């Protein structure tokens, strides 16, 4: 079946995500207000990026507990990632691309993140050339999955995976406790 | 023996000194106690984590500072990206003025070692470096130095007008000249016959901007041998500033 | 012949050390390490330069060590025999310069990588033209296999004693690395 188990594996995924982010030097060096911003947005895409990586195989039949194409976007994305054979290294930079997004509203450290994204693409363009050849083709392939990700929503995710567990709590409140808890 | 309004409140931004060593040392003791089937560190890698924490603490000290608080993050990070080394070193230096003595180095963790036992157990590249620091720790203890002129310097390094891109250039313009003066008063005030002491302190600055570069070059070298821990902060700080 | 060859044997030694010294991934070294390398690689790297410049020279009844002499001879010939192009000669030199085996190294993992990227960038050159990798590859490794028998004590006596007269080729080296700094 779907509900308790996937939501559990999904929730596990959220932790691993935040642990990843939290330990980044370029990240933990930021003030909390700013750390909180980044995370209060990217958490949704980033979770998706993790779950694709752990090859999450879920299917929710439906024989406020459905939207329609919304749950499709997720599968489509997963499959795209899979069909592209992404190594742990690329995943890591992909997450980086999402995380360091200077456009996010509420940032005050725009310029700082500019450079972080820059280096993010830098170390990536480098890895690509390292592994196999080209960079014109593989770049488009990656941006391909990223583009397919921007259409996920962050209301659907929380509802599909977390509402069963979290119940009646603001996901945004959760992040704060997570930027502090465990570790 | 009184101090100007500036330095009086600057001393208020101090980190404590008991509070930290508890934090750090418990963190490190925790880092090694940690359960990884692999990953020894070990002596070096662990010392990088120490240096990291120090820098973390140094950033708290910074953000939790009166003149630093105003002026927003984008610029906050630019000041940090310049002196992160110089400060990290200086902190150590002073710690060697306070609790440093004979052939004994005092870590920020409150532990101590034999300068001889160190120098022998370390590679030449790192000697040309530690010695280079001591050359200064002693040179300067000689010039009757302490926590008062210390924190003056910290801000002086942190707020170097010799940067580049930023908006609130006026703020640094201010404090750079507002602390130069504030220090000048204290020079002769609570001290006997130094006369040119101000010029001397202000003189040992490039002599530390210089120990810095060589220290970074060492970090990069050790980094490129893989000896530097995974998510380490110094190497991170180095890539932002370097390129 | 003596003044003739030794005069140019140094023109290679310097031609060599300059190549090494002005190497960016080399500048990143504590010198004491930066030296450990040169203190060994110099003899070979030298041979590779001379063999690249087709340095011909003969002998006379000038001294005795024969095995030492015949080894050098065999080397230059095997090199010329293999029509080693410019790039190949370069990549060979790197291969000699970086071996993590040298005792006293503090940066093994670093040079191992360099060592790696060298034979990597070398394979690409082969790919680009002369096919049959294992062939051109094991072929060049043959040249390198010869260097093993050179001492570097002999190289000294051969091309430098007549000109240096006792200053060592230890005292020499130190100067070089820092001289053009």
Number of helices of chain B: 12
Secondary-structure element series of chain A? HHHHHHHHH
The topology string of helices and strands of chain B comes to HHHHHEEHHHHHHH
Morphology call of chain A: globular
Helix-residue proportion of chain A: 55-70%
How big is the Rg of chain A? 17 Å
Structural class of chain B: mainly alpha
Name of the level-1 CATH class of chain A? Mainly Alpha
Major beta sheet, strand line-up of chain B: 1-2
Name the quaternary structure: heterotrimer
Distinct helical segment count of chain A: 9
Q: What share of residues are in beta strands of chain B?
A: under 5%
Q: Quick one: which chains have the greatest interface?
A: A-B, 16 and 16 residues
**How many distinct folded domains of chain B?**
1
What percent of residues of chain B adopt helix (DSSP H or I)? 55-70%
Q: What is the CATH superfamily of chain B?
A: Retinoid X Receptor
**Count the strands of chain A?**
0
PDB class: transcription
Keywords: nuclear receptor, regulatory complex, DNA-binding, Metal-binding, Receptor, Zinc
Assembly: trimeric
Entry title: Structure of Dax-1:LRH-1 complex
How would you describe what is shown here?
The complex is a heterotrimer, with 2 copies of chain A and 1 copy of chain B (243 residues). Chain A contains 9 helices and no strands. With 183 residues, chain A is mainly α. Chain A has one domain (1-183): Orthogonal Bundle (Retinoid X Receptor), CATH 1.10.565.10. Chain B is globular, with a radius of gyration of 18 Å. Chain B has 243 residues and is mainly α. Chain B has one domain (1-243): Retinoid X Receptor (Orthogonal Bundle). Chain B has 12 helices and 2 strands; from the N terminus they run H-H-H-H-H-E-E-H-H-H-H-H-H-H. In chain B, strands 1-2 form a two-stranded antiparallel sheet. In chain B, strand 1 (104-106) and strand 2 form a beta hairpin. The chains are: A mainly alpha (183), B mainly alpha (243). Chain B: This is Nuclear receptor subfamily 5 group A member 2. Chain B: It is found in: Nucleus; Chromosome.
